Amino acid sequence: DYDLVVVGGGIVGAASAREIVLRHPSLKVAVLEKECKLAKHQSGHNSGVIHAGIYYKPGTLKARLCVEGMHLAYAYLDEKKIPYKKTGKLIVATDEKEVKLLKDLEKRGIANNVPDLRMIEGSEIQEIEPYCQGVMALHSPHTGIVDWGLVTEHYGQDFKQCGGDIYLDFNVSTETPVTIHGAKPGQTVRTKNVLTCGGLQSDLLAEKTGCPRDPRIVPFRGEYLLLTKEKQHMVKGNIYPVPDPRFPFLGVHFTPRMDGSIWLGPNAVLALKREGYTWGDINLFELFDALRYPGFVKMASKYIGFGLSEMSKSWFINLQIKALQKYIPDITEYDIQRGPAGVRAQAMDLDGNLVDDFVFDRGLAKRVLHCRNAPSPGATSSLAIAKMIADKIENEFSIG
Amino acid sequence: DYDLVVVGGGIVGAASAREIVLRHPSLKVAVLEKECKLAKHQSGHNSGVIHAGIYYKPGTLKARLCVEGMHLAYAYLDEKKIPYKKTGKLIVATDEKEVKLLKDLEKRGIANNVPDLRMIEGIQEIEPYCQGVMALHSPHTGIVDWGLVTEHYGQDFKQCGGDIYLDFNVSKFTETDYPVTIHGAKPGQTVRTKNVLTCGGLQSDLLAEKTGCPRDPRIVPFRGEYLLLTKEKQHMVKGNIYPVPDPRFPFLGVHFTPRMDGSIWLGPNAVLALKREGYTWGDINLFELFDALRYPGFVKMASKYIGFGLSEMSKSWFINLQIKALQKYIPDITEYDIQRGPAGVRAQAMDLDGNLVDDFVFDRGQGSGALAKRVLHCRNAPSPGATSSLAIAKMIADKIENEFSI
Amino acid sequence: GDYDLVVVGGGIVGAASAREIVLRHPSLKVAVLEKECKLAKHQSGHNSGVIHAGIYYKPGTLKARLCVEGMHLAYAYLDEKKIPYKKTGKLIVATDEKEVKLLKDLEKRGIANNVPDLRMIEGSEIQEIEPYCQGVMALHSPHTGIVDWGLVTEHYGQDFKQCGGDIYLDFNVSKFTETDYPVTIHGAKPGQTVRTKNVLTCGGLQSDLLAEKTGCPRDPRIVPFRGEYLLLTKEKQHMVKGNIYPVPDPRFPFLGVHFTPRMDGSIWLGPNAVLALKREGYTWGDINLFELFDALRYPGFVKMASKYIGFGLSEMSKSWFINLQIKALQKYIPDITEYDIQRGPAGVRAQAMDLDGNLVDDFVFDRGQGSGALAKRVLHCRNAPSPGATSSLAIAKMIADKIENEFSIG
Amino acid sequence: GDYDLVVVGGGIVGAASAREIVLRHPSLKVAVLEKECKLAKHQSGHNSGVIHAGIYYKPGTLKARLCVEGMHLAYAYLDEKKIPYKKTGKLIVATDEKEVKLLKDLEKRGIANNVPDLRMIEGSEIQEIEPYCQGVMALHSPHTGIVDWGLVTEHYGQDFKQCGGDIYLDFNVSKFTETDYPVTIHGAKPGQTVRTKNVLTCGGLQSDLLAEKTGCPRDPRIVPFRGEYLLLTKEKQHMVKGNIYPVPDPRFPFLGVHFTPRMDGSIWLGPNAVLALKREGYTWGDINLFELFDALRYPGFVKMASKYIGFGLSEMSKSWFINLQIKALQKYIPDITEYDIQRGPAGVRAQAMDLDGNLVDDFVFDRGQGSGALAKRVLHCRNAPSPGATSSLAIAKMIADKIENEFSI
Ligand SMILES: Cc1cc2nc3c(=O)[nH]c(=O)nc-3n(C[C@H](O)[C@H](O)[C@H](O)COP(=O)(O)OP(=O)(O)OC[C@H]3O[C@@H](n4cnc5c(N)ncnc54)[C@H](O)[C@@H]3O)c2cc1C
Ligand SMILES: Cc1cc2nc3c(=O)[nH]c(=O)nc-3n(C[C@H](O)[C@H](O)[C@H](O)COP(=O)(O)OP(=O)(O)OC[C@H]3O[C@@H](n4cnc5c(N)ncnc54)[C@H](O)[C@@H]3O)c2cc1C
Ligand SMILES: Cc1cc2nc3c(=O)[nH]c(=O)nc-3n(C[C@H](O)[C@H](O)[C@H](O)COP(=O)(O)OP(=O)(O)OC[C@H]3O[C@@H](n4cnc5c(N)ncnc54)[C@H](O)[C@@H]3O)c2cc1C
Ligand SMILES: Cc1cc2nc3c(=O)[nH]c(=O)nc-3n(C[C@H](O)[C@H](O)[C@H](O)COP(=O)(O)OP(=O)(O)OC[C@H]3O[C@@H](n4cnc5c(N)ncnc54)[C@H](O)[C@@H]3O)c2cc1C
Ligand SMILES: CCCCCCCCCCCCO[C@@H]1O[C@H](CO)[C@@H](O[C@H]2O[C@H](CO)[C@@H](O)[C@H](O)[C@H]2O)[C@H](O)[C@H]1O
Ligand SMILES: CCCCCCCCCCCCO[C@@H]1O[C@H](CO)[C@@H](O[C@H]2O[C@H](CO)[C@@H](O)[C@H](O)[C@H]2O)[C@H](O)[C@H]1O
Ligand SMILES: CCCCCCCCCCCCO[C@@H]1O[C@H](CO)[C@@H](O[C@H]2O[C@H](CO)[C@@H](O)[C@H](O)[C@H]2O)[C@H](O)[C@H]1O
Ligand SMILES: CCCCCCCCCCCCO[C@@H]1O[C@H](CO)[C@@H](O[C@H]2O[C@H](CO)[C@@H](O)[C@H](O)[C@H]2O)[C@H](O)[C@H]1O
Ligand SMILES: O=C(O)CCC(=O)C(=O)O
Ligand SMILES: O=C(O)CCC(=O)C(=O)O
Ligand SMILES: O=C(O)CCC(=O)C(=O)O
Ligand SMILES: O=C(O)CCC(=O)C(=O)O
């Protein structure tokens, strides 16, 4: 029926499908998404921050797309007149031990070409955020916030305007040259090749492939806390902490929203379910397969204490606010409301390392391909990652 | 925006909305559904059998709606030309004890006048691969895609001017000629209307508490797992083969029915689900788990029928036990001929005394406010809601006309 | 250097085994190690205390011969040592026609095993023996009785000590090491040491765990089956005069929840067959996670659960809600209710299971592989045929015969 | 009728209290009821075996005065009875500058508590006492010794029996009833009974459960904390000559995992502070649903967990994966790897907790609320100040003073 299929209606699957039709406006392309609308998971439950690229090492690949995709974003945001707001980000350090890591963030940032990286300290901290403390802080006024779920549906609007079709409520679940079946009998779409970009199910899409199970996706939920509208003037822009460089998580941070709300998060607690957006939502066969994975216990043998304290502050938010008072001490417990959350698609190898790079796997064979992982931030680098994915398309599939 | 809104895109929520607009084309009616499509839960995960009424006591409203629903169904299926197959229904009895419970069903079935029962003894001509000692021949029974006819209910509802709101998860009722306002999960998605009706099925109790209705009764999920008979032995079952069920429970037991595509599926069973929408065994929700266990009526029913609940659970853990039970009817089926298939969840209502509620349950908030008196909740409907959909719709329409003055 | 033979186990099996071996060989220096404070602290001290006559067992096997011979040896032992006992009758009652056909099989097995002296009593003559019990047909056995089997174990140790034997209490055997006496036994306490030539273990609930400390395989495995009891209050103690047993399923060694009087006049209801979540799990709450991750990971557990999990869940369900247990007992005594019962103490069965899932009921002797010192000289009795209390003296003669053959004792 | 006063509890506190009450009153028929088979089979028999000098305790308090006097009273008792002991000397190391400020606060407290020959040393002088141990600064208490408190507990019992006292072993107290001897104590066995006039219970892990039998409130409830130890191999035992303690968090009574030699020459690593899912839960898998459901339904449990859940989870994490435990130990002696240790025995702490969630470290005497014979003649010592073993002789004299005023003896 078609010539190319992109399984997954996320910001990665939409930007990759939008990029490949502007390349060649000749192929009949389709997008398969199991939910009603696009950006219903990771790209719909993110912090909304347009990252600049500070934590990443110079000369890396992750820092290449992050600085590029951020520039490609602001270009696409003005092209489509997408509402955005350049708020700026202050990476505040409390102890001197965080300052030593904060200077490593500045040294790694000057080489990634981040616009207007300034290291402030002292009374110059409150001139940008008047309610935040700290000893030293790193300023990046080029960072902004935007509705990434709104940019994702704008990617599909462009994709649909170029002869593309977005098959929604299509939950994939066969050579006829390939035919993709679904949950409803009779729901089948035939095409030449297929590219799968599932979020927390990219590992399960490998089984249809014939790919090896690894790297398995480990769900890490990121809970957000809503600050009451009474005292939201206390947060003007992004207020990030200095995280542990051993983990890709950046820590619970103060970030404004487009509607004026101030969400505090996200955290990094292990989810008992792939799509486990709530604590009580537990799937037995989805964690027994996650805990029997050889790479989990390896990482658990070294980082269990860091995961337990994330869940301890999640069970008792009085401990969470106590840590947040290091930055804004004028925040009480009666000002906090438990809001929604998102779950990360954390890839992991059998050695216990959270996968950092691109992961493309193929078994059906050769005709399929699974972007099982992409460098983060996937939302900021979306258009940049969409190019690198599109350049892996014409090679294996022989396109154009 | 509208004058009446039916919360729930199930088969009884779409049939009630279809009936209320055909009776009153002067009314702007809307339908709010949280899923993407209509009939996504109970109406889309059922055995598909067009029941005729046998297990139901004569003179009961439950027995009257099923005999009225089956004639309205075949008439509606012929009106829209929806594919259906009228298969036989043999209620086979094995032991002599099942016979004493069975000849009650015949006299109970003929009393409600179902055309046309025939007591058989000595079954290889309606079902050659089946066994037993005595059964009932119900040729008027049939299979159907209840999920497909539910979309036809919504198609008729949209043809007459009604709007179907999909991906609309009712989260909050508020006060605003349209006093009540319904809120969705997405910010900004709101609908103002005059009066509200909720047919949330599995969330009928949860939706009722948002208006002011008590926790009584509560919806207790009972999963109905199905086993798919392999393609090499689909010829062993021609029509529906039902067992002789225990009258103390509304469940009809694991039975043999073909689907519209010719596939023979074995089920469903009756097992407590640890989640309202727990279609799989691993998927459990703690707050919904403890909501069912902390209910006063749960421990009361468990104090008298836990052996039967653990009976179905043990047969679900080890399917070889389920095979030994199904071999009483067709002994030519082994563990190598079945596979794990899909399932459905029953929206079983339970009172504070542990009794599974069966009759109609309409409830509204206490007082004379806006959210009260204007929002009526249908917390339960007599089974089978799929077959009796058109008959229940006429019953619900009369309740809406009486409660909301139309 | 200490003893010639050491018996690890203070129960009725190990005590009778040590008593029998010293009576046959007065020159032997034999010792007994018990991990608890006193003899008969577990199975032998938490039982129904009924002296079985040997009805349920098939004719021709050894268990049928051991129970009847052990019962005769018991009454002569109780009369010799002046031990109190009441020869209360046993009445196996059937309530429906299905249990009648199976009770007829119990009559043929009882008359072939020569149990004195059964009679098939009709439903009209049931109250002539039990004026409150109902039923359609029953099987009477007037020569069974009740006795404090825990007290009989103390008498076995008293005879063992009066022949020169030593009983080491509070001695928890933990490891065997090589040393005239090349076997050294170590306790849990530092310095607890006993040198011996040959060891015989009757660990009961830990028979499999003791065997693995020598070189024996994990099979057979000891699966704990707790037997809970109920206390019928005094206000209705007169409704039961003797023993009222139900007609059990022949597929299981469990005899079912029965009415049994005690030596103090009490009436106990039980025991049931509840899977204990602990080797010594006498209560419903005490769980040992490691004893679960090994009892379920055993290849034979799921094989038995695949066929009889509904039977075990039935016993657990009637324990969670005793109103279901009351209705079952009302088939026999229909005028007791939930206000007349109290939860009492329980016992845990040392149920031996093979790799195929079948509950073993024969003699299982095991020793380490090879020709080492820990092997050959340490023989483990993994299982003894039930009832261990009634067949105690009979099993003791056969264990002593096995010890003489295995250890070359003059 | 039988005795004048009985002492429920075979531990070192119950034995020393019964020993003290009969030395001051030789005409008092006193008995001791112990549910186990031997004396000191729980806390008094599964401890670190250290004779504390009195460092971490606040000066001027009762807890600081009992340990200092009890240490001198014990050393005099051991020399009198010729009980073997070794003075190894404690050494508290600070690894970073954050712990050195806490270490100096321990110095000031130790000086005020009159700890003999306490000196503060640092990097150059620590290898002079412990060559294999690293660190920034150290607090050297050379008079801290080790002893077998289980052997000392039995020496208390033989002294209690020399003066006419009776020790009832395998006596599981299960029920108190009314009858010159008005109160009757019931055992777990039938007919196992004893009568007396007054009762003093030192149940340790069952301090509260014994008090509930005579009408006392549920508070304070005993919360079980397991103290796990690790056995260092005999090869590397020469690398630890004396006691090596870390700088503990002053917010908790726990002293942390420490290096400690024993009488037989073994070097044990511990104890830790993991929450036991069973009151007598000496192993990881030993749980009890009844003893746990009531442990969670206690109002103070959620409060204490609401503020210190991470400290307890970190201890459990270092016990689940011992590679994290040896890493924390390599901050002191880095030559010890995972191949040098193996899981050993453990002990359970009878930690008392109030309704607000604070770990009570003071005396808690309780009696029945009514005015009957049970509610006025059974005094329950629901908690004793830490440490119980070192302060054994000092606590016994004040417990004897309490029962002398409570019962007018
Ligand atoms: C908590 C959180 C906060 C974040 N904050 C930021 C931030 O501030 N800035 C930033 O730049 N990035 C941020 N990110 C990163 C960014 O949001 C994600 O990395 C990005 O959305 C990844 O795109 P994706 O399409 O792979 O994920 P997804 O959005 O999950 O896309 C996958 C899609 O595949 C579909 N799918 C899955 N399985 C199937 C199937 N079987 N059949 C059909 N469809 C299927 C799903 O419905 C889904 O829509 C954040 C991520 C998280 C988790
Ligand atoms: C296993 C099984 C087999 C069956 N087999 C048969 C058979 O053979 N024959 C027969 O006649 N009957 C059968 N039935 C009965 C029949 O399927 C049901 O009784 C009937 O579908 C119930 O109608 P309903 O509209 O409540 O269903 P549902 O589809 O469950 O209606 C509930 C609807 O409300 C929606 N909703 C819930 N909460 C909200 C909210 N907050 N906002 C918006 N929408 C919401 C849900 O998404 C759902 O679409 C079977 C039932 C089961 C469980
Ligand atoms: C609930 C129940 C009811 C019963 N009712 C009856 C009845 O009515 N009539 C009848 O005839 N029979 C009855 N029996 C059977 C009888 O009670 C037992 O079969 C018999 O007691 C088994 O003897 P034993 O010594 O092997 O058991 P146990 O007494 O359990 O023997 C094990 C002993 O070894 C010790 N031990 C274990 N490991 C070690 C170690 N490492 N070191 C040292 N010591 C150790 C234990 O402390 C214990 O003392 C009943 C059994 C049960 C469980
Ligand atoms: C791991 C650990 C390490 C320690 N290390 C040290 C150290 O280095 N130095 C130091 O000075 N202190 C130390 N201590 C403290 C000291 O060991 C204890 O505080 C001390 O044993 C308390 O005395 P006790 O009698 O209450 O103890 P316990 O021995 O626990 O006293 C309770 C006694 O009462 C009995 N009992 C309970 N209920 C009943 C009943 N119903 N009927 C009859 N008897 C009953 C018990 O069997 C037990 O014998 C340590 C404690 C622990 C847990
Ligand atoms: C395998 C079983 C589960 C183990 C899982 C391992 C996951 C590891 C998660 C790493 C933690 C998440 O990321 C972690 O976030 C915390 C909390 O914001 C940051 O913490 C930092 O910022 C917070 C503010 O939020 C300050 O209060 C805090 O003092 C400071 O340390 C850490 O610097 C960062 O490392
Ligand atoms: C844990 C708490 C559980 C709460 C308990 C409430 C749930 C109780 C469920 C009982 C109802 C299940 O429904 C029950 O299905 C079984 C199995 O199909 C039927 O059983 C019948 O058919 C089966 C085959 O299908 C035959 O093997 C069987 O001999 C016959 O009785 C029963 O007649 C019916 O009563
Ligand atoms: C590891 C797998 C799970 C455990 C495996 C199964 C172990 C348990 C086997 C069944 C338990 C023992 O089974 C025992 O005998 C039968 C059932 O067989 C019952 O026997 C009797 O029960 C009651 C009387 O008390 C009567 O109403 C009943 O008709 C009759 O059968 C006993 O009450 C029961 O105690
Ligand atoms: C009821 C649920 C709530 C959980 C209950 C809370 C329990 C609190 C337990 C406190 C922790 C135990 O006590 C704690 O031991 C650790 C580890 O030895 C000590 O830690 C110290 O010593 C260790 C090694 O011994 C060093 O590696 C470490 O850097 C240093 O801080 C802490 O200083 C002490 O505070
Ligand atoms: O898990 C993370 O910290 C990465 C998500 C992110 O980019 C953010 O929230 O700012
Ligand atoms: O057994 C039930 O619960 C009713 C479902 C039904 O109607 C059927 O499967 O035929
Ligand atoms: O029923 C059992 O499991 C055997 C126990 C026994 O011998 C009895 O209670 O009589
Ligand atoms: O719990 C503790 O750490 C205190 C017990 C003690 O004195 C020790 O182990 O040194």
C touches A (3+ CB pairs < 8 Å)?
A: no
Q: Does B293 touch chain C (CB under 8 A)?
A: no
Smallest Cβ–Cβ distance between B36 and the set A36, A273, A280 belongs to: A36
Q: List C-alpha distances in Å: D274 to A379, D277, D331.
A: 42, 9, 21
Which residue, D243, D239, D231, is CA-closest to D140? Answer: D243
Ligand nearest to the CA of A219: 1
Contact at CB, B167 and A286, closer than 8 angstroms: no
Residue type, D54: G
Distance CA A191, CA A399 (A): 14
Tell me which residue has its CA closest to atom 18 in ligand 5.
Answer: A251
Q: Which of C43, C44, C50, C391 to mutate to test the pocket of ligand 11 (most atoms within 8 A of CB)?
A: C50
Do residues A135 and A123 make contact, with C-beta atoms less than 8 angstroms apart?
no
Q: Which of A94, A308, A310, A333 to mutate to test the interface with D (most CBs of D within 10 A)?
A: A308
| DSSP 8-state secondary structure symbol assigned to residue A191 | E
Write out the DSSP string of D45-75: TSS--EE--S-SSPTTSHHHHHHHHHHHHHH
Strand partners, D353: D221, D359
Same domain membership, residue A250 and residue A172: no
Is D302 inside a domain boundary? no
Same domain membership, residue C154 and residue C26: yes
Distance CA B257, CA B142 (A): 9
> Number of folded domains in chain C?
2
Nearest atom in ligand 10 to the alpha carbon of residue B253 is: 1
Q: What is the maximum span of chain B, computed from C-alpha positions, in angstroms? A: 68
The domain that holds D20 is classified in CATH as 3.50.50.60
Do residues D205 and D279 make contact, with C-beta atoms less than 8 angstroms apart?
yes
Q: Which two tokens stand for residue C30?
A: 């034999």
Q: Are strands B218-229 and B264-267 parallel, antiparallel or unpaired?
A: antiparallel
Smallest Cβ–Cβ distance between D286 and the set C170, C283, C288 belongs to: C288
Distance CA B339, CA B229 (A): 7
Touching chains, B (3+ CB pairs < 8 A): A, C
Same domain membership, residue C274 and residue C199: no
- In angstroms, the separation between the Cα of residue A137 and the nearest Cα of chain D is 23
- Core vs surface per residue A161-180: b (16+ CB within 10 A) or e: eeebbbbbbbebeeeeebeb
Same domain membership, residue C230 and residue C202: no
Do residues D40 and D347 make contact, with C-beta atoms less than 8 angstroms apart?
no
Q: Are strands A216-227 and A269-270 parallel, antiparallel or unpaired?
A: antiparallel
Same domain membership, residue C309 and residue C264: yes
Ligand nearest to the CA of C229: 3
Strand partners, C200: C7, C379
Is C326 inside a domain boundary? yes
Q: What is the maximum span of chain C, computed from C-alpha positions, in angstroms? A: 69
Distance CA C394, CA B13 (A): 75
Ligand nearest to the CA of A12: 1
Cis peptide before B187 (omega within 30 of 0): no
Is D9 inside a domain boundary? yes
Q: Which residues of B are annotated as a binding site for FAD?
A: 11-12, 33, 42-43, 47-49, 51, 170, 385, 387
Q: Does A260 touch chain B (CB under 8 A)?
A: no
Residue type, C25: H
Q: Which of D34, D36, D37, D268 to mutate to test the interface with C (most CBs of C within 10 A)?
A: D37
Do residues B108 and B91 make contact, with C-beta atoms less than 8 angstroms apart?
no
Distance CA A210, CA A216 (A): 14
Do residues C302 and C308 make contact, with C-beta atoms less than 8 angstroms apart?
no
**Residue span of the structural domain in which B259 resides:** 220-356
Same domain membership, residue C403 and residue C269: no
Tell me which residue has its CA closest to atom 32 in ligand 8.
Answer: D248
Do residues C309 and C302 make contact, with C-beta atoms less than 8 angstroms apart?
no
Residue D113 phi, psi (nearest 5): -85, 5
Residue type, C42: H
Which residue, D260, D216, D307, is CA-closest to D50? Answer: D260
Do residues C272 and C227 make contact, with C-beta atoms less than 8 angstroms apart?
yes
Q: Which of C12, C42, C47, C269 to mutate to test the pocket of ligand 11 (most atoms within 8 A of CB)?
A: C47
Q: Locate all alpha helices (DSSP H) within D228-373, ordered by sequence.
A: 289-296, 299-320, 322-330
**Chain D residues within 8 A of A319 when measuring between CB atoms:** 306-307, 309-310
Same domain membership, residue A296 and residue A243: yes
Distance CA D349, CA D359 (A): 12
Ligand nearest to the CA of D315: 8
Nearest atom in ligand 2 to the alpha carbon of residue B12 is: 25
Q: Does B187 touch chain A (CB under 8 A)?
A: yes
Distance CA D314, CA D310 (A): 6
Distance CA D384, CA B395 (A): 73
Do residues A348 and A216 make contact, with C-beta atoms less than 8 angstroms apart?
yes
Do residues D103 and D55 make contact, with C-beta atoms less than 8 angstroms apart?
no
Query: In this structure, is the dihedral angle defined by the CA atoms of residues D88, D92, D95 and D97, taken in order, positive or negative?
Result: negative
Same domain membership, residue A290 and residue A250: yes
Count of C-beta atoms within a 10 Å radius of residue D81:
13
Touching chains, A (3+ CB pairs < 8 A): B, D
Same domain membership, residue A335 and residue A236: yes
Smallest Cβ–Cβ distance between A286 and the set B166, B167, B282 belongs to: B282
Which residue, B6, B343, B9, B369, is CA-closest to B191? Answer: B6
Distance CA C244, CA C126 (A): 11
Distance CA D20, CA C111 (A): 69
Q: Does A286 touch chain B (CB under 8 A)?
A: yes
Is B148 inside a domain boundary? no
Residue type, B77: L
Determination technique for this PDB entry?
Answer: X-ray
Reported residue count of chain B is: 406
Distance CA A167, CA B243 (A): 42
Is D42 inside a domain boundary? yes
Is C72 inside a domain boundary? no
- In angstroms, the separation between the Cα of residue A199 and the nearest Cα of chain B is 19
Strand partners, B103: none
Distance CA D366, CA B289 (A): 41
Same domain membership, residue C331 and residue C230: yes
Same domain membership, residue C335 and residue C251: yes
Count of C-beta atoms within a 10 Å radius of residue B226:
21
Query: In this structure, is the dihedral angle defined by the CA atoms of residues D291, D296, D301 and D307, taken in order, positive or negative?
Result: positive
How many cross-chain Cβ pairs, B to C, lie less than 8 Å apart? 35
Distance CA C291, CA C191 (A): 28
Smallest Cβ–Cβ distance between A304 and the set D307, D310, D317 belongs to: D317
- In angstroms, the separation between the Cα of residue B302 and the nearest Cα of chain C is 9
**Chain C residues within 8 A of D264 when measuring between CB atoms:** 190
Which residue, D85, D14, D32, is CA-closest to D388? Answer: D14
- In angstroms, the separation between the Cα of residue A206 and the nearest Cα of chain B is 22
What long-range pairs does A106-110 form, CB within 8 A, spacing at least 24? A106/A138, A108/A54, A108/A55, A108/A56, A108/A57, A108/A58, A109/A52, A109/A53, A109/A54, A109/A138, A109/A140
Is A399 inside a domain boundary? yes
Smallest Cβ–Cβ distance between B283 and the set A169, A279, A283 belongs to: A283
| DSSP 8-state secondary structure symbol assigned to residue C338 | G
Smallest Cβ–Cβ distance between A281 and the set B167, B281, B285 belongs to: B285
Q: Are strands C341-353 and C221-232 parallel, antiparallel or unpaired?
A: antiparallel
Distance CA C23, CA C159 (A): 9
Is B9 inside a domain boundary? no
Tell me which residue has its CA closest to atom 7 in ligand 11.
Answer: C387
> Which residue, C314, C330, C353, sits at the end of a domain?
C353
> Which residue, C353, C371, C387, sits at the end of a domain?
C353
Q: Which of D169, D279, D286, D294 to mutate to test the interface with C (most CBs of C within 10 A)?
A: D286
Closest chain C residue by Cα to residue D280: C286
The domain that holds B224 is classified in CATH as 3.30.9
Contact at CB, A280 and B288, closer than 8 angstroms: yes
> Which residue, A336, A353, A370, sits at the end of a domain?
A353
Torsion of CA B75, B79, B82, B84, to 10 degrees: 30
Q: Does D302 touch chain A (CB under 8 A)?
A: no
Distance of CA C60 from the midpoint of ligand 4 (Å): 57
